[PDB]
Structure formats: C-alpha cells, structure tokens
Amino acid sequence: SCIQFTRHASDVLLNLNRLRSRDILTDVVIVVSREQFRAHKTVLMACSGLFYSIFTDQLKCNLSVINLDPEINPEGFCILLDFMYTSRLNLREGNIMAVMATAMYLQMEHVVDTCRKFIKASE
Amino acid sequence: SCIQFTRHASDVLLNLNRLRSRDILTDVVIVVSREQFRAHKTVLMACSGLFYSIFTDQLKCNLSVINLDPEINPEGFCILLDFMYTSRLNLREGNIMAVMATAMYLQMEHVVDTCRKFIKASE
C-alpha cells in the first residue's frame, strides 16, 4: 500500500553527482593510464559489474586506489563515469569504440547494448 | 548531444538498497531512541537536508555514529530510511503524524508536502 515519488531516484543521483563535483565523501581514486578519477565506491558498484566484484572482495574493499588495465582509454572511462552519475552518455563517432571496450571491461551491460546497436546502424 | 538511459537512476537506487540489505560498505549507524540503523552517508545526504548539513561539517563528517533527537520515533525513521533507498513511502493513518514530524526534522521537503496533503484530506 506504499505511495511512490516518481522523481526520487533522479533527485538522489543528481545530489550524488553534486557531491562528486565538490569532491565530498569520495573514498576511492580510479587510475587510468596515469589519469586519476575520484568517485564513491557505492556508486561505482551500483553501475558496474567489475566495481561490484572489486569492492565486495574482503581485501580490495579497503583499497583507496584502484588501477585499471593499461589498455583502458581515460576518455572512455571519463564518459562512462559521467554516465554513472547522470544517466547521460556522450556517445560520438570518434569515441564509440573506446566507450564500448571500456563498458565491456566495466561490465555495464546496457551501455554495451546501445554501442553494439549504434555500430550496427553505421555498417 | 548525449543519449539518456531512462531506468538508470532507478537501477542505481535498487543496487544501493541491495548493498544496504547486505550491510555492504555502510559507513554510519543512526541511533533513534536506542534503535540502530546502518546506512550509507552519501545516500542519507542525497535524501535529507539534515544529513547533508551533518556530513558536510568538517568534524561530524568523520563520525561513525549519529544520535537523533530523543523526540524522533524509530518507526517514523525506519519508514523514511526505506523511502530514501526505494522511492516508496509506507504512509498509513497510524503513522502519518510520526512520519511527517520525522520528515520535517530530516528536512525531506517532498515527504512533508505529501503528509500535509493527506492530513488535509482527512479533516
């Protein structure tokens, strides 16, 4: 018999992104080919199968720095980190291959799906 | 020129609630008249003007235990904590006064608004 507030989830995500932009309560640095990205472990886990596995590990859950595979493109990661905190994906002809490869590595199934569809339309 | 995934914010909140239910990466205990509630500081801040003020304070941001005012009803808090992580509010004739008072103290403006409207309809 609950009532539901339609905009609640969007408002929560908007506030989490405001915290990220002001570097409030960020608890991890993600290192991508020397580029560094500060974030909230819980948000990373909520969006990515890879981060979910990493931060549920009894040893890795305590790390303040995570280094990604050197094949990962920092721009592709940045676009995906922005998507995690906003639901918006900056998908362009020039970045789609790097975004898809990064989403496959991060295990972000819905992003991989839209990249496959956009690539298939161009062939 | 971004594309947007409609269900992303809801899916993020659903995963954050799964983490809460398994007590994964919870970093604070909220004490309400001896009852204890584990939660994520970032989610509490994203939903409540009171928690936002508390955890942006340079001293309180580091506390692992927060004690609420003794006038706060634990059931009212529990219903609001559930709403924070799900967008669903269990509003009933028997709890509406405690829920509204708790939402006013926590500074959750949209919850206060629906409680005022439901109370006005019954008069």
Binding site: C2, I3, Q4 | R88, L89, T114
Partner: peptide, 4 residues
Amino acid sequence: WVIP
C-alpha cells in the same frame, strides 16, 4: 506521487 503515484500508486506504483
């Protein structure tokens, strides 16, 4: 607010 809605009935979910």
